[PDB]
Design an enzyme around this catalytic site. Structure first.
Site, mmCIF file in Angstrom:
data_model
loop_
_atom_site.group_PDB
_atom_site.id
_atom_site.type_symbol
_atom_site.label_atom_id
_atom_site.label_comp_id
_atom_site.label_asym_id
_atom_site.label_seq_id
_atom_site.Cartn_x
_atom_site.Cartn_y
_atom_site.Cartn_z
ATOM 1 N N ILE A 1 -3.796 3.784 2.183
ATOM 2 C CA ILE A 1 -4.196 4.096 3.536
ATOM 3 C C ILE A 1 -5.432 5.008 3.589
ATOM 4 O O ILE A 1 -6.242 4.873 4.494
ATOM 5 C CB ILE A 1 -3.036 4.654 4.383
ATOM 6 C CG1 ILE A 1 -3.430 4.657 5.857
ATOM 7 C CG2 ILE A 1 -2.605 6.034 3.912
ATOM 8 C CD1 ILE A 1 -2.299 4.979 6.801
ATOM 9 N N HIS B 1 0.824 -1.213 0.000
ATOM 10 C CA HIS B 1 0.000 0.000 0.000
ATOM 11 C C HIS B 1 0.839 1.236 0.000
ATOM 12 O O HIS B 1 1.994 1.239 0.417
ATOM 13 C CB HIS B 1 -0.995 0.038 1.175
ATOM 14 C CG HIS B 1 -0.450 0.617 2.447
ATOM 15 N ND1 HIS B 1 -0.421 1.973 2.698
ATOM 16 C CD2 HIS B 1 0.011 0.023 3.578
ATOM 17 C CE1 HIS B 1 0.089 2.190 3.898
ATOM 18 N NE2 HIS B 1 0.346 1.021 4.459
ATOM 19 N N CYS B 2 0.208 2.304 -0.453
ATOM 20 C CA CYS B 2 0.806 3.624 -0.373
ATOM 21 C C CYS B 2 -0.251 4.604 0.124
ATOM 22 O O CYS B 2 -1.081 4.210 0.951
ATOM 23 C CB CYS B 2 1.523 4.009 -1.675
ATOM 24 S SG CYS B 2 0.544 4.312 -3.093
ATOM 25 N N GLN B 3 -0.240 5.868 -0.316
ATOM 26 C CA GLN B 3 -1.175 6.849 0.253
ATOM 27 C C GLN B 3 -2.616 6.696 -0.234
ATOM 28 O O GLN B 3 -3.524 6.543 0.584
ATOM 29 C CB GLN B 3 -0.719 8.289 0.012
ATOM 30 C CG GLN B 3 -1.508 9.307 0.840
ATOM 31 C CD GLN B 3 -1.233 9.177 2.318
ATOM 32 O OE1 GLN B 3 -0.078 9.044 2.729
ATOM 33 N NE2 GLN B 3 -2.279 9.223 3.136
ATOM 34 N N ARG C 1 0.909 5.369 -6.299
ATOM 35 C CA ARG C 1 2.274 4.813 -6.375
ATOM 36 C C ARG C 1 2.280 3.297 -6.592
ATOM 37 O O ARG C 1 3.134 2.791 -7.319
ATOM 38 C CB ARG C 1 3.098 5.172 -5.133
ATOM 39 C CG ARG C 1 4.604 5.101 -5.315
ATOM 40 C CD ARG C 1 5.201 6.457 -5.653
ATOM 41 N NE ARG C 1 6.665 6.423 -5.624
ATOM 42 C CZ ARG C 1 7.420 6.420 -4.520
ATOM 43 N NH1 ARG C 1 6.875 6.437 -3.298
ATOM 44 N NH2 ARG C 1 8.746 6.390 -4.638
#
Length: 103
Positions: free
Chosen positions: A90, A60-62, A66
């Site tokens: 997230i 995961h990223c933001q 990404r």
């Protein structure tokens, strides 16, 4: 393949690794308690360490960008695991009402 936050939770309950590919400053500000931090740049240089390998790996990223844009890199970095990308990062995890840790 993308995975919902609730489906990711079920895989994590069965030992799946959740890997946060953001930087440490971002992680320290707000992260998923179950996640292991491994910034993408570090993964690109030295690979996924053995301690973060598993049959199932969820990155995961933001907000999903990404992970989506580096899907081929991530597919290789975690090979030969079954690999997932957390849908909407997230931000998605928060929107689903799952817990985060805020500084």
């Amino acid at each position: 393949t993308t995975i919902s936050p609730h489906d990711a939770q079920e895989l994590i309950a069965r030992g799946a690794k959740l890997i946060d590919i953001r930087d440490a400053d971002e992680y320290l500000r707000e992260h998923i308690p179950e996640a292991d931090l491994a910034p993408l740049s570090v993964l690109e240089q030295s690979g996924l360490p053995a301690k973060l390998r598993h049959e199932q790996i969820i990155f995961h990223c933001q907000a999903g960008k990404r992970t989506s844009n580096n899907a081929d890199k991530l597919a290789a970095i975690a090979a030969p695991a079954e690999i997932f990308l957390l849908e909407d990062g997230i931000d998605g995890w928060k929107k689903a009402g799952l817990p985060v840790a805020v500084n």
